[PDB]
């Protein structure tokens, strides 16, 4: 994906300002990182450019989805500039801001060798164009004031380098709209399209793919594409329940619903059937009767539903065999959305199983790939990070890619 693109192997940083998009977009719970995999990530670029005389390099990523609010209470990026000077072996300066004079003046003439990290980016509406405002509504940038803020990035480097594999699926503005001469893929993005075009070109089959989490409304989405590439299909985690409820008729509780997705889920089982993809949904639940670490928990079936002020949180046991029978089937599988909300234990029995199967199956030769800032958390918690043959920075990023997608942030590079 990069042979026609600049990379970063052939960009001259010596005496260069570089501004560098980066996915540090990092899971938290309690207010710390519980997972530093997409920081680390980065080091390999970030290193690169220092010793090859970079006079500066600046930083910048999202954080979550504060949905174009300054939130530095609840999505501040300030942990991990802490946690990149221990990776880097070398300081980090983090700005309370990511555009605006204090943040040029900041960046315009730096110390050499200085790295500074800017806050969150989607404290401002023009990141992603559009979101919402401290009331709730939803709101639109401006075109001009979108202009206006790629041009305030612009000026933060001489260069600039997209490393975020993991946000590359986002037409956003600090991934498309940077104007400067040259614009290079990192190390990261290389690695990780190199891995996936050729994971990708002539996969072992069957080939799985396991679709869970929690963002419904974006991920439900790709399902469409990926029904002509796989040959079997989990639809797990939160994903499960807008299926069910039209399928089955199923009572779901307060469980995560999409609206628009439950307009097509029909159209998608019909072409599954028509491409021969075996669709395995969960026929068991863990409920809950608040979405907290703490609440009461229950159990339920599709037949018996889920009952109402309920939401189920995590499969049962009888998903887990149907999950396991899909595992065993495979010769290559891509994983993206734990199976339940493994973050709190009484939820994380579902998503435990099926990674054992999961690295099972690899010892047996299974190509497996884990996928996503949440996800690959998974491995962390349970140590099976070297015990699948790829885990990514990318969830939705490799899912796009498993669509057959040229992802935005590497068509905006360079050509060469
Ligand atoms: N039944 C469920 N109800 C609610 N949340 C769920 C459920 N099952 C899983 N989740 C949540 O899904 C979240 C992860 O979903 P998400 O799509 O963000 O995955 P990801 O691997 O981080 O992907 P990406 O890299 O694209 O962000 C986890 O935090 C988990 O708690
Ligand atoms: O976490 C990401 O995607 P992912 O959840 O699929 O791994 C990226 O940081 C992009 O975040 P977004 O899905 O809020 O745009
Ligand atoms: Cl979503
Ligand atoms: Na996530």
Redesign the pocket.
Known sequence: SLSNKLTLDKLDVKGKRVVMRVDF?V?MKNNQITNNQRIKAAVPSIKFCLDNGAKSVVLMSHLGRPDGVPMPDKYSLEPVAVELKSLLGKDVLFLKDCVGPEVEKACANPAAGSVILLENLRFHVEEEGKGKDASGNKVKAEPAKIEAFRASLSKLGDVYVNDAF?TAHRAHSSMVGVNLPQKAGGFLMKKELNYFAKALESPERPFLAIL????VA??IQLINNMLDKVNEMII???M??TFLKVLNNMEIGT??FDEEGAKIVKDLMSKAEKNGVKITLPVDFVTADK?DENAKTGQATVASGIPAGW????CGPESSKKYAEAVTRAKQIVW?????????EA?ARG?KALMDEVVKATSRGCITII???????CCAKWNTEDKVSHVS?????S?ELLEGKVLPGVDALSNI
């Open positions: 977009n899971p993991g869970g989490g929690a963002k974006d991920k797990g985690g939160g499960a329940f469980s995560l979405f939401m189920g949180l995590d993206n959305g734990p199976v339940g909300v493994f973050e709190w939820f998503t996928g996503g800032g949440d996800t690959a958390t920075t990318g969830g939705g990023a899912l």
